């Protein structure tokens, strides 16, 4: 794709079409649902899962103790550094996973559509298909709704695709 | 006319559920357990050398409590302190008990 569509506010992935009977835009549903479920599961794993810790060691000091103070400070600083590293890595990994699954859902929808219309259309390359027949808004609906029968328009397309 | 050819991957009737990044639970053909939880209930006498210390804490063997005489001059790799142990001799206490115990153990 070259950019995103801002006017889409009832979904995340969508089709845009321009046939002789007008231009239109309609968002795909189940792709967005499958992309929302995964992010919600991610959050449910992350948020609200905090364990209890009641009595710990002291971590501030107003008196020069000597050795035991050194040890306690070292323990706490070590734990803090390790947990911060784990946190940064976890956040980076989960964000990469979010990006990956979103890209995967977009490309999955694209390939599903491409495989629906076997030879009746062509891959222009820019995230848009070139249909090679007259396709009313009901034909586009049958595209998105999944009930597009390729054998119907097939021959027509081939003619207009080769002659 | 023409033929057909499908691509597929095997499956099983009864798989096992595992955890991943995407799905907290997802089924697979087979999975092995990485968290050991089964204990056979007894201490194997090899390859590490063992001293049972039946009725004797390591300190009583050190000072040489009269019941703790079978341990004289003995060596070990692991000393198994029993909870039933006691001391049947003259009372005493040890400043920094744990420290002496740990260094004698090592």
């Amino acid at each position: 794709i070259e950019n995103g569509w801002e006017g889409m506010v009832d979904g995340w992935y969508g089709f845009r079409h321009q046939n002789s009977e007008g231009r239109g835009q309609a968002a795909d549903l189940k792709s967005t649902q499958a992309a929302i479920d995964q992010i919600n599961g991610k959050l449910n794993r992350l948020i609200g899962k905090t364990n209890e810790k009641f009595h710990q060691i002291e971590k501030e000091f107003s008196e020069v103790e000597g050795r035991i103070q050194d040890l306690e400070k070292y323990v706490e600083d070590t734990k803090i550094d390790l947990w911060s590293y784990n946190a940064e890595l976890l956040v980076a990994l989960e964000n990469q996973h979010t990006i990956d699954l979103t890209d995967s859902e977009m490309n999955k929808l694209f390939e599903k559509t491409k495989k629906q219309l076997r030879e009746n259309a062509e891959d222009m390359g820019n995230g848009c298909f070139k249909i090679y027949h007259k396709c009313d808004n009901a034909c586009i609906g049958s595209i998105r709704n999944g009930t597009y029968d390729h054998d119907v328009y097939r021959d027509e397309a081939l003619n207009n695709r080769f002659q | 006319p023409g033929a057909t050819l499908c691509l597929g991957h095997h499956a099983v009737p009864n798989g096992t559920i595992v955890k991943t990044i995407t799905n907290d639970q997802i089924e697979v053909t087979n999975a092995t357990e990485l968290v050991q939880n089964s204990s056979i209930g007894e201490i194997c006498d090899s390859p590490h050398q063992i001293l049972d210390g039946e009725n004797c804490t390591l300190i009583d063997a050190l000072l040489g409590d009269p019941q703790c005489d079978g341990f004289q001059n003995k060596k070990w790799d692991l000393f198994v302190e029993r909870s039933k142990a006691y001391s049947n001799c003259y009372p005493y206490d040890v400043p920094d008990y744990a420290s002496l115990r740990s260094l004698v153990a090592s």
Partner: antibody, heavy 130, light 109 residues
Framework: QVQLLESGGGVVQPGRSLRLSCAASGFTFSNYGMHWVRQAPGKGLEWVAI????????YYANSVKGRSTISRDNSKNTLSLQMNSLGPEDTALYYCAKLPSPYYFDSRFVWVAASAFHFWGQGILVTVSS | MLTQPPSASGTPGQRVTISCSGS????????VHWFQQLPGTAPKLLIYTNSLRPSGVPDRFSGSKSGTSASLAISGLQSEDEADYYC???????????FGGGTKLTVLG
């Protein structure tokens, strides 16, 4: 938590019409799509109807299709259900509830969350007989 | 309309599973969810999105979905979990939320 009051229970003579109204407070009604489910005494859970967060999409059960109606008011924070042509198979407890559902029934603001807002109300009992 | 067996049984701490089977329309094409009905009370939402538990729910409950087969496992099952358990999911053909038959489990008495 959330506090709702449920009105419209009782006994409706056969062939007549009911009127249930669930009115809640303590959360943002405007965001969540609602459900009506029914439970025949004895046992069983039968879904009835569903309405979005604006009223755009209203969907009904095949068992009551064409003879029931759902509605909502967002200024009064009220959900309501109507059903006519009642028989003995309709006498039941009626729960107003936010069920997990496809996302477009909920607001744009509450598609993604870690809590997944949910609640059921107590039953509203309606019985049909002389 | 959803094949959920009538009864389940177990012993305190036996991790019993309740099954659910649907069609290519409802479960194969949409996530599932699970409710618990304690006698004389409204169903509480146990599980949603086939594995997810809300704020109040323990971790003893687990779930899964494979094609047209949903599973609700209870690991640390105990005295106060004897209730009715319902599997439910959204079906596109009927454009509606179809429930399950229901299940009542008992424990080792």
């Amino acid at each position: 938590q959330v506090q709702l009051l449920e009105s419209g229970g009782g006994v409706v003579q056969p062939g007549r019409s009911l009127r249930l109204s669930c009115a809640a407070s303590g959360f943002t009604f405007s965001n969540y799509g609602m459900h009506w489910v029914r439970q025949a005494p004895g046992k069983g859970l039968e879904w009835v109807a569903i309405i979005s967060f604006d009223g755009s999409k209203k969907y009904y059960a095949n068992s009551v299709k064409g003879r029931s109606t759902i509605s909502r008011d967002n200024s009064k924070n009220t959900l309501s259900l109507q059903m006519n042509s009642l028989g003995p198979e309709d006498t039941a407890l009626y729960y107003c509830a936010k069920l997990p559902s496809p996302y477009y029934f909920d607001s744009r603001f509450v598609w993604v969350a870690a809590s997944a807002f949910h609640f059921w109300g107590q039953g509203i009992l309606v019985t049909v007989s002389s | 309309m959803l094949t959920q067996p009538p009864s389940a049984s177990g012993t305190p701490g036996q991790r019993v599973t309740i099954s659910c089977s649907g069609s290519s329309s409802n479960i194969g094409g949409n996530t599932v969810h699970w409710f618990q009905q304690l006698p004389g009370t409204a169903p509480k939402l146990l599980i949603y999105t086939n594995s997810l538990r809300p704020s109040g729910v323990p971790d003893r409950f687990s779930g899964s979905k494979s094609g047209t087969s949903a599973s609700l496992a209870i690991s640390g099952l105990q005295s106060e979990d004897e209730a009715d358990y319902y599997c439910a999911a959204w079906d596109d053909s009927l454009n509606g939320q179809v429930f399950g038959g229901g299940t009542k489990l008992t424990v080792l008495g």
